Structures are given as structure tokens and as C-alpha cells.
Amino acid sequence: MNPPPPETSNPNKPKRQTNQLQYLLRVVLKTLWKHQFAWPFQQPVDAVKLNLPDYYKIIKTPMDMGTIKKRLENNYYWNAQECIQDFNTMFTNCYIYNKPGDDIVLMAEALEKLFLQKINELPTEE
């Protein structure tokens, strides 16, 4: 069985909409979301359909771009670093669970290269 997905809504968590967070949605997430390798990362890993009974025994902090997209659209974050960590968690989970040469790993690295190139020009806070 799959665990419940990460939280995307929490009304007692403080939130805001900084220009950095707008950039993470409009530049960073949109760039990765449209990429040819985005599809495995657009929703939580469905370990049941994929028949990976051990995935959520090894991956204790799941994350994915569907969760990140909902969080940005919901203005769930307080700062840019919370959102950047989610991306890095999602990439790291992939490298942690899988074999170094795997397709899913190459897909992850292609998205992460773009991720790094975009956050390198993260604007200073307005």
C-alpha cells in the first residue's frame, strides 16, 4: 500500500508569496514540468501499481513535482528555501532508491541540471 501523499494544505502553517516563490513557480517548476522526462516526477511514486513494495520502506520523505506544484499554487511555502528543499528531496530520493545507471536516474539528472541552471538566477527578494 501507498502512504498518504505529502501535505499540500495546512491553514495553521504561515505562508506568503515572495518574488522568489513566484519565480520558483513561473520559471523553475514550469521549465521542469514541460520537459520530456518530467512524467515520472509529476505525481507521487505509486509503489502499488509499479510493484515496488520496498519503495516507501527506503524512501521516508517522499516528494514530487505534483506536490511541489500544488504547494506553489496554494502558496503553501514561507520562503524559497522550503521549496528548493522539496526539489532536492525529490532528486535525492531518486538517486537513493535506484541504480546509478538507470533510466529514471538519467531522467532525474536531466531535470536537476535544468533546476540548477534556473535557481542560479533566483532573484533577490523584492
Ligand X SMILES: COc1cc(OC)c2c(=O)cc(-c3cc(C)c(OC[C@H](O)CN4CCN(C)CC4)c(C)c3)oc2c1
Which residues in this chain contact ligand X in the complex, by CB under 6 A? 40-41, 45, 50-52, 94, 97-98, 104
To the nearest whole angstrom, how small is the minimum distance from the Cβ of residue 51 to ligand X? 5
Is 54 within 8 Å of 11 (Cβ atoms)? no
Cβ nearer to ligand X, comparing 33 with 78: 33
For ligand X, the nearest residue by Cβ is 40
Cβ nearer to ligand X, comparing 48 with 116: 48
* The C-alpha cell that represents 65 in the structure block: 513535482
To the nearest whole angstrom, how small is the minimum distance from the Cβ of residue 98 to ligand X? 5
Is 41 within 8 Å of 90 (Cβ atoms)? yes
3-state secondary structure of 60: coil
* The C-alpha cell that represents 34 in the structure block: 514541460
